[PDB]
Design an enzyme around this catalytic site. Structure first.
Site, PDB file in Angstrom:
ATOM      1  N   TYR A  95     115.253 -43.959   9.361  1.00  0.00           N
ATOM      2  CA  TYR A  95     115.687 -42.349   9.863  1.00  0.00           C
ATOM      3  C   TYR A  95     114.895 -42.739  11.363  1.00  0.00           C
ATOM      4  O   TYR A  95     115.556 -41.836  11.928  1.00  0.00           O
ATOM      5  CB  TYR A  95     115.180 -41.582   8.572  1.00  0.00           C
ATOM      6  CG  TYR A  95     116.458 -41.380   7.722  1.00  0.00           C
ATOM      7  CD1 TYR A  95     117.144 -41.387   6.899  1.00  0.00           C
ATOM      8  CD2 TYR A  95     115.140 -42.927   6.289  1.00  0.00           C
ATOM      9  CE1 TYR A  95     118.209 -41.244   5.830  1.00  0.00           C
ATOM     10  CE2 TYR A  95     116.171 -42.618   5.269  1.00  0.00           C
ATOM     11  CZ  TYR A  95     117.518 -42.386   5.018  1.00  0.00           C
ATOM     12  OH  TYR A  95     118.376 -42.406   4.286  1.00  0.00           O
ATOM     13  N   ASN A 118     128.102 -37.232   4.990  1.00  0.00           N
ATOM     14  CA  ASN A 118     128.272 -38.383   5.407  1.00  0.00           C
ATOM     15  C   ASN A 118     130.228 -38.327   4.871  1.00  0.00           C
ATOM     16  O   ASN A 118     129.563 -38.326   3.666  1.00  0.00           O
ATOM     17  CB  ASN A 118     127.960 -39.435   5.796  1.00  0.00           C
ATOM     18  CG  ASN A 118     129.267 -40.852   5.582  1.00  0.00           C
ATOM     19  OD1 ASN A 118     130.601 -40.830   6.373  1.00  0.00           O
ATOM     20  ND2 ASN A 118     128.768 -41.453   5.196  1.00  0.00           N
ATOM     21  N   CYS A 126     125.993 -44.923   5.336  1.00  0.00           N
ATOM     22  CA  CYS A 126     125.008 -43.931   5.144  1.00  0.00           C
ATOM     23  C   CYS A 126     124.100 -45.376   4.070  1.00  0.00           C
ATOM     24  O   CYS A 126     122.295 -44.899   4.376  1.00  0.00           O
ATOM     25  CB  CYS A 126     125.439 -42.617   4.719  1.00  0.00           C
ATOM     26  SG  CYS A 126     126.123 -42.627   3.161  1.00  0.00           S
ATOM     27  N   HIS A 127     124.559 -45.661   3.973  1.00  0.00           N
ATOM     28  CA  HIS A 127     123.119 -46.797   2.735  1.00  0.00           C
ATOM     29  C   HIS A 127     122.502 -47.421   3.306  1.00  0.00           C
ATOM     30  O   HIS A 127     121.658 -47.964   2.925  1.00  0.00           O
ATOM     31  CB  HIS A 127     124.855 -47.785   1.839  1.00  0.00           C
ATOM     32  CG  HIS A 127     124.908 -48.686   2.512  1.00  0.00           C
ATOM     33  ND1 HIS A 127     126.027 -48.167   3.163  1.00  0.00           N
ATOM     34  CD2 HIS A 127     125.340 -50.003   2.998  1.00  0.00           C
ATOM     35  CE1 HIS A 127     126.930 -49.075   3.750  1.00  0.00           C
ATOM     36  NE2 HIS A 127     126.624 -50.711   3.151  1.00  0.00           N
ATOM     37  N   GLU A 153     125.597 -56.685   0.769  1.00  0.00           N
ATOM     38  CA  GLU A 153     126.144 -57.067   1.819  1.00  0.00           C
ATOM     39  C   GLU A 153     124.695 -58.337   2.098  1.00  0.00           C
ATOM     40  O   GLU A 153     125.221 -59.287   2.281  1.00  0.00           O
ATOM     41  CB  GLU A 153     125.233 -56.006   3.144  1.00  0.00           C
ATOM     42  CG  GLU A 153     126.420 -54.482   2.791  1.00  0.00           C
ATOM     43  CD  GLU A 153     126.236 -54.353   4.061  1.00  0.00           C
ATOM     44  OE1 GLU A 153     125.761 -54.053   4.798  1.00  0.00           O
ATOM     45  OE2 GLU A 153     127.181 -53.173   3.798  1.00  0.00           O
TER      46      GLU A 153
END
Length: 165
Positions: A95, A118, A126-127, A153
């Protein structure tokens, strides 16, 4: 008049919504109060371009999204959501880093808050933001969804094994 289409997914039923071929929403909307949805017209038909891409992202084949987005919300939210798009698949930022990027050093806590509003959840990633502590946020199941997306991912096998020969 927004039209929407809910589809299935490994992290649960993902509702897609907007005008025509542009996306305004993408959440997993079940089990929270979502009165906006009642004002929408169902449409098993639309957004199938994006539904394809979503299927492929989960399959592990897609890494980058090609989709039309109309992102709405405050100016601060848009700068935040725009910067989220600049995060590569399988990477993270803090952040604090996002706040620097959108030119507001110190707004880490403001970026966390923007993040939670979001409207388009996987395509606007946003993850992929996480604080120094390393702890996941999001509301209830939201946390486990995030972890899921992050483990997805991080796990992706290299594409071209021929680089090894």
């Amino acid at each position: 008049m927004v039209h929407y289409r809910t589809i299935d997914s490994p992290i649960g039923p993902l509702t897609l919504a907007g005008h025509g071929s542009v996306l305004t929403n993408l959440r997993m909307l079940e089990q929270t109060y979502e009165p906006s949805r009642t004002h929408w017209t169902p449409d098993p038909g639309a957004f199938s371009g994006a539904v394809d891409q979503l299927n492929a992202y989960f399959a592990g084949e897609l890494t980058e999204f090609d989709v039309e987005l109309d992102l709405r919300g405050t100016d601060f939210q848009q700068r935040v959501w725009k910067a989220l798009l600049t995060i590569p698949y399988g990477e993270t930022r803090s952040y604090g880093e996002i706040a620097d990027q959108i030119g507001a050093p110190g707004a880490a806590r403001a970026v966390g808050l923007a993040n939670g509003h979001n409207p388009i959840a996987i395509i606007v990633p946003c993850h992929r933001v996480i604080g120094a502590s390393g702890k996941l946020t999001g509301f209830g199941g939201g946390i486990n969804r995030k972890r899921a997306l992050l483990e997805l991912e991080k796990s992706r096998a290299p594409a071209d094994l021929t680089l090894f020969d």
